[PDB]
Amino acid sequence: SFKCVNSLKEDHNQPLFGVQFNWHSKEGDPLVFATVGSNRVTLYECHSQGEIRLLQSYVDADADENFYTCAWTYDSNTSHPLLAVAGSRGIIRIINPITMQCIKHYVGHGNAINELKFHPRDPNLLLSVSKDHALRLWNIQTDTLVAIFGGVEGHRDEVLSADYDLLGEKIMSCGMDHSLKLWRINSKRMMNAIKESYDYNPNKTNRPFISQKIHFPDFSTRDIHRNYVDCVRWLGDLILSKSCENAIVCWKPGKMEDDIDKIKPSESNVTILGRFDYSQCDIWYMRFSMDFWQKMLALGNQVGKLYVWDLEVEDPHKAKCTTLTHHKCGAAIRQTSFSRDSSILIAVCDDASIWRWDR
């Protein structure tokens, strides 16, 4: 259970499409989160009395840029937290969150970037998904494009979301073609390509770095949803995904007993384990989130209502749901984030408003 202890609004008055607490922080450091909207990324510290202290912002040199998403990692070189951001321009900016300057940036996607994710074990491995139908894997330590996932059996419309599994051995992606696609990155080929991206030094060579063109996923399905799939998340070997049909579905490839790592690309069966129902969330690009321990699940709707499910139950159908509402919160909640200690939940909205809920 939660209480709303504060709200504010950013002065660009554009949608805030993203929010991420920094889980890559240190001992006792203030709780910091980033918001992305318009052409800016903004950093806030959380304090008691529900105080939300604005720290710094980065505004893009290009007034036409519109950032959609961000993700935290560690800078392997300096050991400080880094923040990657991307949006409609299809350019990944790597931001020093301390100084809010762009250190470097990556171009290549033929269009808007819809989602960024860092590998759960290796801080240098950045995943991006794009309006151009492709996913790309980057090594941000050596600035290399490791692989492009797309083409023959790739997505056939915009890729909207993706997620590494817990170990960082595989990725599930989803998009406007209604499909969810599995891509193993622990194959001998991909492990080797990652090894090569680390061994690449452009000062000591004239060879360019060659990307892998992964045209075929290791599993694909369109039998979970009947519309844009705009958020996917691993729950162990299970998947949580949502379309714009008012439910998050909990499912797995193959039969109940089939191990995810035995699944073949020809596999045509799926097993649905649970469904989380809610209302008035039919627009696309509405993302759900989970706390650090994955004990809970949060999703906001298009009228400013915040759902939180208790996932701490034997079977998915059993989960109870809390709804958080405030008479002043009436705009689409695009995304939520939990602080690392699960004590704070933040929601950001289409009217540039930010909402703090304390556990």
Binding site: P15, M176, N227, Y228, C244, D282, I283, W284, Y285, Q302, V303, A331, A332, D350, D351
Partner: peptide, 8 residues
């Protein structure tokens, strides 16, 4: 074929 916004 599918809207991203519910507001003006």
């Amino acid at each position: 074929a599918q809207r991203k916004f519910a507001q003006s």
